[PDB]
A paper describes a structure:
MalT is a bacterial STAND that controls the Escherichia coli maltose system. MalT is known to cycle between two states, a monomeric ADP-bound resting form, and an oligomeric ATP-bound active form.
Here we report the cryogenic electron microscopy (cryo-EM) structure of an inhibitory complex consisting of MalT and MalY, which reveals a heterotetrameric assembly with a stoichiometry of 2:2 between two proteins. After 3D reconstruction and 3D classification, a subset of 176,969 particles were used for final refinement, yielding a map with a global resolution of 2.94 Å. The overall structure of the MalT-MalY complex is shaped like the capital letter “H”. In the complex, MalY forms a homodimer with each of its subunits bound by one cofactor PLP. Notably, intramolecular interactions between the NBD and WHD of MalT are directly mediated by the N-terminal segment of NBD, indicating a critical role of this segment in maintaining MalT autoinhibition. The MalT α8 helix and its N-terminal segment dominate the interactions via packing against one side of the PLP-binding domain of MalY. MalT R173 at the C-terminal side of α8 forms a bidentate salt bond with MalY D182 and E185 and makes van der Waals packing against MalY C181.
Author numbering:
A (entry chain B), C (entry chain A): 1 to 390
B (entry chain C), D (entry chain D): 1 to 399, 405 to 417
The structure:
């Protein structure tokens, strides 16, 4: 079938992981685990579809308000998340974060707030403060089994007269928490009661490992809302910029479309991104299932090795991602010492945790979306660098 | 007022096979929150629901049409179905629905559940053809409904495809019962029984089974072969060959060749004219088609097997099967494209005569007769105001805008 | 060598010209001349380069602050416009209009003005008013030979205390006027004197027919300025969204880069757009020269046919574009009658002139960037529809 | 103060060949606004410009270095070249440059042109190595200069590549004279003459011609083969084979193998130490290298043919050819990486001794000696304030950062 147990070079292709030391490191001869793409080649169906769109030759203006694009999106939702969508509400955007920022500019003024769950994805802070909107964070709490938002503190935050938007990352990043039906119910009710619109970033929707399925925002969605996503992380094609979303209250959908086409002139899509998304959603299910199996095997290998090297970790593989958010606090080790040991004694770049702010102290973020050959070296390096500084 | 044809369980199962395979599946429907039956049109799922419902009395029924896509009318009809299921028990919410003194469907449903909690017996509510709803507000409110309904209630939704009801939530908590397309198809034994009960010549069972699979057990396909053989158009296998794997477009020209051309031209005109009506009874028939033995005409049509179905046992209201109905509409918009506006006007005035201004408005705007709406308004301003058909009013005039200006000068 | 005398189908490829009647027409069975791309297939060098980037397979994150991208841009400028650039001032953007809008948001407040020359490109009004900045137009005047901006009125406009930006389209659109050295000198001096920054949109820089060549903004540029362009119109690849520019006063370049990467999350480029631009600029010169010859032949054929059918037109081919901005005012004909005759009696869609506002009354805009087979039908249709309504 | 080595025309006339065609091309340089000479380093274009300048007296010269990339120093040196070309005629702008009472380079140049218009004789200004300028303000001001200069002035710019001077504007109006890379290369006859005048063994023209083309007529290539044959390293064709089509990297290791290893180690140390100096005279040599017969050492080096060139006929100032100079710098940063800071300090204090605080600052920040800058400051606060070297002061502090923090405390 498919083979993921092979290394593609990725040298000399301008890629931010293998071709650029700064600022991931300084030695430039490291094994990189810092950036959150996957080392795999995308699905052969997407490649063949692009190859066939290339033989056409002409690359004139194209339209995204298609009929095959929307049909493919609806088919993906129905057969992979058992959710039905009104395909006349799907909108296009260059990137997920662009749509997030546009909606923030639309559903709030300057100086008002945007709730997020921390440790949050990096770019969320950039998008929120770049528009001069204040971040209002709510910390997930790790305990016995996974991470748990405390609805008391969340409701206390939402009650503020300034909080207008809730930027929900589902599945969460980097913890990998998949929200349960009950959590989504309560969050939606609280948001509706306190007049807070919701933006649901769901770009990780496909990489779920738990036995409970991820639940879409639209099923619990009320009034104005938005569900933004892309097949980039799922199929490893972020180099073909393109994202889609679902905005409701057609007045808001229309305001967004006006801003996208008129004010910022971004309406012309990338015809190859649409070709990739169509081919992926209509024929990329076997490839994606094989990849899911492989990524779960990698995560469980990490868990075995680590929990066997230091019996007092008790690390469980995350609910849904291919990014291990390792908690090293039960080892009483200092992170700067660990980072120096990793860089110099071992030559392995592993993104530290304090870059996520204060909630990240004591963690590391290990990209597991790579062939096992590389993962073995990475985890051996981490184990050695821990022992050598313990 | 409420069109009775929309609030009654279809009947007239003169020759319907009954299969436990599906009735047994539905037997436990009280333990769940929602019974979702989905398949392309012509499955016979609606016939099964009517069968399953013939053995209950505390069960409301609600057939949908595109006009239901407005929210106030939707609420009115839904509360009507609830009353029929509980025998007038929910009076307060009924008056709130008739007087439109509710902020939003969710508040109306909260009030309904206050009253619903008191009822202690199993309750059932059937909503037919949910795919015709495209209003997101209605979807939202129906999700709220399913989330907050009392446990003795069970909702039954018949649809063409997966609806936007928050189904994944229910599937997670095992509160959902589904009967998909595959289960609804006729098996070999059922096809044998069907061709036995309906045909003049008996068919060997294997031959019926061969007809059964090559058409995928699709019910309306079987009905087509049956009625074709009734007139002895073909031997069965030839018609089945004509029908095997037929798509929407080829179904149309098949209908054109085999069902329209094998009747007399008078009945053809009757069908093409009557098609534009949503629900038909004797009065509307005799008004639009001019033929006076209207009830005679309808009952004889139903005898001929042309996809006309009653909507109550009293034999009062009738409806076409949506496939055949839409086909007849599209064919009439050509064979009689010239005679459309006067026919729409006759239908509209006949509707108003029976006391239903809303269908009159629909058919009038279909005709494009401004002064027709003018007369509808000065003829029922009393009921339009006392029953507050205000969104009806705004859409109608807004949908002759220079003539509509009237609403401009009314706006200030 | 190359062959442009052939018709590519372009049916079923989502293209806004051949697949979408609305709102270019209503009959949907027309010969379309409305949208400003070219019916040609792009250069075989670009196609081969994309094809070779596809066989790699991996489409992870990429970087535009490359060394081959910048080298190719500098080589293009030096060998095609005899202008040297500091390649460390080149910035990237998703589209030209996006960069225009970002700079407008940066170099002015709300309610201030943006000078443009009318008849202006359509999207300029959208970008300027979408940001709630008032347009302050200056009308070119057609006379004996081409169009002439009157520096008296221009200076009168610039003197306003509200005018802050000048959006210079060079070569102009749709008139096709190429600014002379003297014009550029005087405009730059006037702008500098009255404290107006300049944004030079130069996306047509390569399609120049006159004997005097195109002079970039940078040679006359001072203080804060910007020169935005792309190889999209030149090589007919707008379906691979990507544009570049040169911003000066490194504070402004940095503010723009911050807005592009941080606030709007658009920094990840389209690796295939960069591949296309590199291949085009390093190897696409023979193809471009052949295409230049062909387009000039098409424009002169139009001129011959028209000026021979109505001797009182006196139409000269434009200075630089492949869009004929035909002036039909010397025929005293009504444009709505002409448009109805073109749609119905002839089945040829030709963009009317009044869509450019009031300055466009009496003109039509005929896309000449097509094989001659189609151009013959188009011009025959226009001649017939004129005669049949004369 | 102004380093004289930067304001004087190089004057070496030993084995140089006279190229008449290029001089003819330059003969009409007064009719134009700009004479642009561009080629990779080692072309000999600078030698041609000096040859073209040996026959004029009213011609200023200005050699550039990376330190010129600051604007005030640039203006000072440029006005100095103008004075040398007009013999002190422009006094007002000179005092404005020395007192830095100008808003911007454009206003200074406007004042200069006021004075420039009065002069009635042809004027010439040579700016060497313009590729070292990367300041956009300087580019802008030089474009203004070229646009507004009086017609009797002609600007000559020597550069590695096309500069940002608004050249297309001039090319349109035919006010530009170019001498590109191709014209500057030595032809066959010129190569014959060159090898004749410089070698101890006569070279057949065809063999010289083969050596001429296979190295593309590149001047410094020829000089390399010549000096190699002077020590009788090789027969000429073998060295040419070693040099044919050589890139930057292979030029480096060639220099390492053939020019550095074929001298005595004392001279090697002398070269490697002296390389870090921009312009060298006897005092700086005897200070840094410790060898006391400094002028003797420099003149004997220049005799040996190691790319040392005078900067005036008085034999006072010397400079390395930028290729060989940068090579020696990169090699010294390894062979003597340990001895760098004390050498930088000696150079800095020797510069300050001669009255030039700016080069002292440069070499000190190269050494990384904070208290060295402290002493430079308390030793020349009088000249730093009276000659207003304030931007020098601001930059230097960031590169004694705690002292810079004290400067930040001074900031308020
Ligand atoms: N049990 C049955 N026995 C015989 N015929 C049936 C049976 N069920 C359905 N049919 C035929 O198939 C058609 C089914 O229509 P149906 O699918 O119930 O409409 P809907 O679109 O509302 O679901 C009917 O016309 C009926 O004649
Ligand atoms: N006319 C000439 N005769 C002999 N040798 C020359 C002549 N011109 C240049 N050269 C040699 O070539 C080199 C040219 O250096 P040059 O290119 O003038 O430096 P720059 O980088 O300033 O242009 C010098 O070292 C010189 O020895
Ligand atoms: C949580 C999250 N949101 C959004 C994005 C999209 O970012 P990008 O456009 O760089 O792929 C990613 C990556 C992501 O992980
Ligand atoms: C004058 C002008 N500016 C900008 C653009 C870029 O627009 P687009 O991104 O749609 O290609 C074009 C086209 C154009 O003709």
């Amino acid at each position: 079938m498919f083979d993921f147990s092979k290394v593609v070079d990725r040298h000399g292709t301008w890629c931010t992981q293998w071709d650029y030391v700064a600022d991931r490191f300084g030695t430039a001869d490291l094994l990189p685990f810092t950036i959150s793409d996957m080392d795999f080649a995308t699905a052969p169906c997407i490649i063949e579809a692009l190859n066939q769109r290339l033989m056409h030759g002409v690359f004139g203006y194209s339209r995204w308000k298609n009929d095959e694009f929307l049909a493919a999106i609806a088919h993906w939702f129905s057969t992979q998340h058992y959710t039905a969508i009104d395909s006349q509400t799907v909108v296009y955007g260059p990137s997920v974060i662009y749509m997030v920022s546009e909606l923030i500019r639309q559903w709030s003024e300057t100086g008002e707030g945007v709730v997020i769950h921390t440790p949050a994805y990096d770019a969320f802070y950039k998008a929120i403060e770049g528009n001069q909107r204040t971040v209002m964070p709510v910390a997930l709490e790790k305990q016995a089994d996974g991470w748990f938002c405390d609805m008391g503190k969340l409701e206390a935050v939402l009650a503020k007269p300034e909080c207008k938007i809730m930027l929900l990352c589902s599945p969460q990043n980097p913890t990998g928490k998949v929200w349960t039906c009950d959590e989504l119910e309560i969050m939606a009710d609280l948001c509706e009661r306190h007049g807070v619109r919701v933006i649901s970033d769901e770009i990780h929707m496909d990489m779920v490992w738990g036995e409970q399925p991820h639940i879409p925002w639209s099923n619990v969605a009320r009034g104005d809302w938005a569900l933004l996503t892309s097949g980039s992380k799922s199929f490893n094609i972020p180099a073909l910029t393109g994202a889609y979303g679902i905005i409701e209250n057609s007045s808001s959908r229309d305001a967004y479309l006006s801003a996208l086409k008129g004010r910022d002139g971004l309406s012309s899509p990338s015809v190859l991104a649409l070709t990739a998304h169509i081919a992926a959603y209509q024929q990329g299910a076997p490839w994606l299932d094989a990849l899911r199996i492989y990524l779960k095997d990698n995560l469980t290998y990490i868990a075995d090795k680590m929990n066997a090297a230091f019996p007092e970790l008790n690390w469980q593989i995350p609910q849904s991602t291919y990014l291990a958010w390792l908690d090293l606090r039960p080892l009483n080790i200092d992170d700067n010492a660990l980072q120096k040991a990793l860089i110099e004694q071992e030559k392995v770049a592993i993104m530290p945790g304090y870059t996520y702010g204060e909630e990240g102290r004591g963690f590391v973020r290990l990209n597991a979306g790579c062939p096992r050959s590389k993962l073995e070296k990475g985890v051996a390096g981490l184990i050695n660098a821990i022992r050598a500084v313990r | 007022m409420l069109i009775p044809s929309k609030l009654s369980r279809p009947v007239r199962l003169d020759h319907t096979v009954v299969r436990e395979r599906l009735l047994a599946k539905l037997s436990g429907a009280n333990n769940f929150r929602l019974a979702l039956i989905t398949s392309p049109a012509g499955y016979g799922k609606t016939t099964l629901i009517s069968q399953w419902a013939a053995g209950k009395n505390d069960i409301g029924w609600y057939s949908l049409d595109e006009g239901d896509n407005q929210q106030e009318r939707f609420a009115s009809y839904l509360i009507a179905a609830v009353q029929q299921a509980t025998n007038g028990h929910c009076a307060i919410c009924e008056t709130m629905a008739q007087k439109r003194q509710y902020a939003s469907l969710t508040s109306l449903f909260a009030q309904l559940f206050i009253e619903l909690a008191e009822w202690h017996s199993p309750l059932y509510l059937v909503i037919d053809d949910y795919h015709l709803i495209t209003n997101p507000v209605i979807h939202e409110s129906m999700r709220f409904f399913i989330r907050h309904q009392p446990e003795n209630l069970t909702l039954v939704v018949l649809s063409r495809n997966l609806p936007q009801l928050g189904i994944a939530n229910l599937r997670v908590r095992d509160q959902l019962l589904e009967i998909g397309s595959q289960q609804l198809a006729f098996t070999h034994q059922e096809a044998n029984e069907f061709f036995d009960c309906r045909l003049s010549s008996p068919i060997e069972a294997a031959e019926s089974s061969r007809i059964c699979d090559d058409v995928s057990g699709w019910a309306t396909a079987l009905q087509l072969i049956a009625l074709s053989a009734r007139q002895n158009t073909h031997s069965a296998h030839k018609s089945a060959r004509r029908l095997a794997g037929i798509n929407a477009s080829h179904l149309s020209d098949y209908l054109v060749d085999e069902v329209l051309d094998n009747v007399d031209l008078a009945t053809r005109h009757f069908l093409l004219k009557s098609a534009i009506l949503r629900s038909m009874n004797d009065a509307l028939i005799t008004r639009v088609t001019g033929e006076e033995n209207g009830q005679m005409r309808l009952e004889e049509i139903e005898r001929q097997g042309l996809f006309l179905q009653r909507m109550d046992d009293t034999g009062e209201w009738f409806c076409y099967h949506p496939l055949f109905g839409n086909f007849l509409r599209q064919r009439c918009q050509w064979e009689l494209a010239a005679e459309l506006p006067e026919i729409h006007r006759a239908a509209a005035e006949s509707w108003m005569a029976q006391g239903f201004p809303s269908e009159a408005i629909h058919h009038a705007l279909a005709a494009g007769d401004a002064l027709m709406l003018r007369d509808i308004l000065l003829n029922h301003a009393w009921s339009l105001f006392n029953h507050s058909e205000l969104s009806l009013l705004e859409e109608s005039l807004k949908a002759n805008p220079a003539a509509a200006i009237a609403i401009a000068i009314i706006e200030v």
